Design an enzyme around this catalytic site. Sequence first.
Site, PDB file in Angstrom:
ATOM      1  N   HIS A 129       9.916 -22.706  -9.148  1.00  0.00           N
ATOM      2  CA  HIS A 129      10.516 -21.375  -9.190  1.00  0.00           C
ATOM      3  C   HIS A 129      11.371 -21.089 -10.412  1.00  0.00           C
ATOM      4  O   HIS A 129      12.127 -20.129 -10.425  1.00  0.00           O
ATOM      5  CB  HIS A 129      11.290 -21.073  -7.891  1.00  0.00           C
ATOM      6  CG  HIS A 129      10.429 -21.108  -6.665  1.00  0.00           C
ATOM      7  ND1 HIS A 129      10.597 -22.039  -5.661  1.00  0.00           N
ATOM      8  CD2 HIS A 129       9.369 -20.349  -6.299  1.00  0.00           C
ATOM      9  CE1 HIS A 129       9.680 -21.848  -4.728  1.00  0.00           C
ATOM     10  NE2 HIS A 129       8.921 -20.830  -5.090  1.00  0.00           N
ATOM     11  N   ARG A 140       4.049 -11.326 -18.368  1.00  0.00           N
ATOM     12  CA  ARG A 140       3.857 -11.729 -16.999  1.00  0.00           C
ATOM     13  C   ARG A 140       2.793 -10.933 -16.248  1.00  0.00           C
ATOM     14  O   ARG A 140       3.098 -10.126 -15.426  1.00  0.00           O
ATOM     15  CB  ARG A 140       5.153 -11.560 -16.262  1.00  0.00           C
ATOM     16  CG  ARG A 140       6.375 -11.957 -16.976  1.00  0.00           C
ATOM     17  CD  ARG A 140       7.521 -11.758 -16.049  1.00  0.00           C
ATOM     18  NE  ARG A 140       8.496 -10.906 -16.624  1.00  0.00           N
ATOM     19  CZ  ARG A 140       9.374 -10.187 -15.975  1.00  0.00           C
ATOM     20  NH1 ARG A 140       9.452 -10.159 -14.684  1.00  0.00           N
ATOM     21  NH2 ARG A 140      10.195  -9.481 -16.670  1.00  0.00           N
ATOM     22  N   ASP A 141       1.553 -11.204 -16.587  1.00  0.00           N
ATOM     23  CA  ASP A 141       0.315 -10.637 -16.064  1.00  0.00           C
ATOM     24  C   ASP A 141      -0.433 -11.649 -15.202  1.00  0.00           C
ATOM     25  O   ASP A 141       0.005 -12.789 -15.045  1.00  0.00           O
ATOM     26  CB  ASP A 141      -0.579 -10.157 -17.209  1.00  0.00           C
ATOM     27  CG  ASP A 141      -1.104 -11.300 -18.057  1.00  0.00           C
ATOM     28  OD1 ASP A 141      -0.462 -12.371 -18.075  1.00  0.00           O
ATOM     29  OD2 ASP A 141      -2.158 -11.126 -18.704  1.00  0.00           O
ATOM     30  N   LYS A 160      -1.547 -22.080  -3.596  1.00  0.00           N
ATOM     31  CA  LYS A 160      -0.348 -21.597  -2.955  1.00  0.00           C
ATOM     32  C   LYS A 160      -0.482 -20.106  -2.822  1.00  0.00           C
ATOM     33  O   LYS A 160      -0.683 -19.410  -3.809  1.00  0.00           O
ATOM     34  CB  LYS A 160       0.892 -21.937  -3.777  1.00  0.00           C
ATOM     35  CG  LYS A 160       2.193 -21.430  -3.148  1.00  0.00           C
ATOM     36  CD  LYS A 160       3.291 -22.483  -3.217  1.00  0.00           C
ATOM     37  CE  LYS A 160       4.668 -21.864  -2.960  1.00  0.00           C
ATOM     38  NZ  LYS A 160       4.612 -20.807  -1.899  1.00  0.00           N
ATOM     39  N   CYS A 179       3.570 -14.385  -8.127  1.00  0.00           N
ATOM     40  CA  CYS A 179       2.142 -14.607  -8.190  1.00  0.00           C
ATOM     41  C   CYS A 179       1.579 -14.618  -6.777  1.00  0.00           C
ATOM     42  O   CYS A 179       2.024 -15.393  -5.925  1.00  0.00           O
ATOM     43  CB  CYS A 179       1.849 -15.917  -8.915  1.00  0.00           C
ATOM     44  SG  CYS A 179       2.580 -15.959 -10.564  1.00  0.00           S
ATOM     45  N   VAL A 207      18.089 -12.678  -5.612  1.00  0.00           N
ATOM     46  CA  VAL A 207      17.187 -13.616  -4.976  1.00  0.00           C
ATOM     47  C   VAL A 207      17.884 -14.334  -3.849  1.00  0.00           C
ATOM     48  O   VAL A 207      19.112 -14.354  -3.784  1.00  0.00           O
ATOM     49  CB  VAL A 207      16.669 -14.640  -5.979  1.00  0.00           C
ATOM     50  CG1 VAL A 207      16.128 -13.923  -7.216  1.00  0.00           C
ATOM     51  CG2 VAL A 207      17.775 -15.595  -6.361  1.00  0.00           C
ATOM     52  N   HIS A 223      15.488 -24.429  -2.379  1.00  0.00           N
ATOM     53  CA  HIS A 223      14.522 -23.624  -1.648  1.00  0.00           C
ATOM     54  C   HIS A 223      14.617 -22.172  -2.066  1.00  0.00           C
ATOM     55  O   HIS A 223      15.709 -21.628  -2.176  1.00  0.00           O
ATOM     56  CB  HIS A 223      14.789 -23.746  -0.154  1.00  0.00           C
ATOM     57  CG  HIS A 223      13.987 -22.805   0.681  1.00  0.00           C
ATOM     58  ND1 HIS A 223      12.665 -23.033   0.998  1.00  0.00           N
ATOM     59  CD2 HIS A 223      14.319 -21.629   1.269  1.00  0.00           C
ATOM     60  CE1 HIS A 223      12.216 -22.037   1.739  1.00  0.00           C
ATOM     61  NE2 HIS A 223      13.200 -21.174   1.923  1.00  0.00           N
TER      62      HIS A 223
END
EC number: 3.1.27.-
Length: 120
Positions: free
Chosen positions: A11, A19-20, A38, A79, A101, A112
């Site tokens: 992460h 960021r595509d 994932k 993603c 976040v 986590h």
Amino acid sequence: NSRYTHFLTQHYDAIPQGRDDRYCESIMRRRGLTSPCKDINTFIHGNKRSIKAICENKNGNPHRENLRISKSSFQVTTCKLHGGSPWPPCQYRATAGFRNVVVACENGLPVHLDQSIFRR
């Protein structure tokens, strides 16, 4: 311990290449998240200085049961798997976002990421 290290691996991306979709397909593969694919994964950008701070009040408030939610907002790229099969090749769709976040902190460090907030 290793759980912090493993948060970073899954992460943290300091400086994203554009960021595509293709970034998602690339970084997922690179970070060992593609066997099997994932389903959803989110990368935080910026400095770690700030993420770890979500474990204190410098940049965090208690949240729900076990978690912490950040005061600051972070650039982020989610993603999301798409296609049907759980198995490579893993086609992804990138969604860049900018918001606080939610993590769990163990011993002053994040171990986590709560992915729920990036599904909706």
